[PDB]
Assembly symmetry: C3
Homo-oligomer: 183 residues x 3
């Protein structure tokens, strides 16, 4: 499978700025032609952990890329660690190894490659999450489909602020969206 | 079925202002009592294609109506073209229009018809999409259930901008919501 | 089952400020590891029915708590009435009470208890609903998971305004979100 996730375990699984500096809590759940997605992010390390824009005003956005082969396995030059990401059983993920989740991938027809044809804005799903769950502390999470090259399919999360933040931990609220499946 | 959609093909399928001037990319996917919906809009023609509010400040909202008989077939005086809209098999629809679509329709109990009784606002699901996928360029998408007359069921999208736009193509981001099913 | 709901009937089922003063229209629908949730609120009685902030500027937020035992039955010191809340069969509920809908519950792993650790903000799902479906009249709906004590699981809705409202009926638009299931 119903579900292809990174375990909810919060053992860091994502490399933004330095090795295993973050936990991306992505959960994809197939309902026929739509994948239902729930996403969250805890930076625990280095750049992007604590934000001081009085210090570093240049720092106010970053990116996490998920790339996939013709089959839909995570290509290990994705920001996300390949081991934790696999179809879920219970509190774990069937262990074994991931293979053949096509149609967990976003539809190429619906969400074309940049090369294949002129892209429209339906490729994108803007959402807003909140740092520390504080209403005064929002940030944007622009999810973008099959727009990376060096892969057959992409999901790519772009995080951005626009507010000058002084000592704010980048741990987000949950956000939910859907996209159209390849099959 | 799982899914009732307009093909993602982007061959114009919707009549807002003039014949086939737009592509409504609606995708309904039944999860028991809830329909999970993903919606997008590309205007390609005439009024509402390029927005100049310096020229036409009066122009900042329009409407797309989906009407359904007792059975849940699109009544062909809906803004959406009746041919492209049918239960999905592959990237097409078996290309013979459906007969038994009910319970893709929004619940009359939950979302009543405009009776004498006190009407509550739970009929409505406000969302925000973004023109050209630009954060500076938002617009509203008020989805409204079973409030149109001359039909048994309605889904109706109301698009509005508070913002004075100078030469902006009305092509939207994806937006996802859910409603309660009739059956 | 697919669905665990409060009937869509407008018969008050929730106690905010005084006995049965409100109708919470909560609808949980299991798609594997994610619950897809649709929520609405009609206050019909007493404090929080009509809002005058010229009169009572102190009044601009309130809370509805859903509590669950190890098994996932609503504990009857929840704001929501235990009788109307049960797995859906037609537009009714088989009128025989459920025990142990676990995995309609939010995951403890994902959404931990306030257990003496660093708590992260992924517990929370901020949304905005609109009073009377009027764009000028928004309110916030901070949904928060497993953060209440005297229970094994919690869903808790926090409603807040920040705008001075003069004679506004607190009846909301629908709002849709998802959380990760326990199992």
């Amino acid at each position: 499978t119903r579900t292809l996730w990174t375990t909810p375990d919060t053992s860091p699984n994502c490399t933004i700025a330095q090795d295993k500096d973050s936990k991306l809590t992505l959960v994809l759940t197939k309902c026929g032609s739509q994948i239902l997605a729930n996403v969250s992010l805890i930076v625990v390390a280095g750049k992007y952990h604590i934000i001081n824009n009085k210090n570093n005003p240049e720092i106010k956005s970053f990116t996490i890329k998920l790339l996939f082969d013709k089959n839909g396995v995570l290509l290990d030059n994705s920001n996300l660690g390949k081991t934790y990401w696999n179809f879920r059983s219970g509190d774990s993920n069937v262990s074994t190894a991931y293979e053949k989740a096509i149609g967990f991938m976003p539809n190429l027809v619906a969400y074309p490659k940049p090369s294949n044809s002129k892209k429209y804005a339906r490729d994108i799903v803007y959402g807003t999450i909140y740092l520390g769950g504080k209403p005064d502390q929002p940030a944007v999470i622009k999810t973008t489909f099959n727009q990376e090259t060096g892969c057959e399919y992409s999901i790519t999360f772009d995080f951005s602020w626009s507010k000058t933040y002084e000592n704010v931990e980048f741990e987000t609220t949950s956000f939910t969206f859907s996209y159209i499946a390849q099959q």
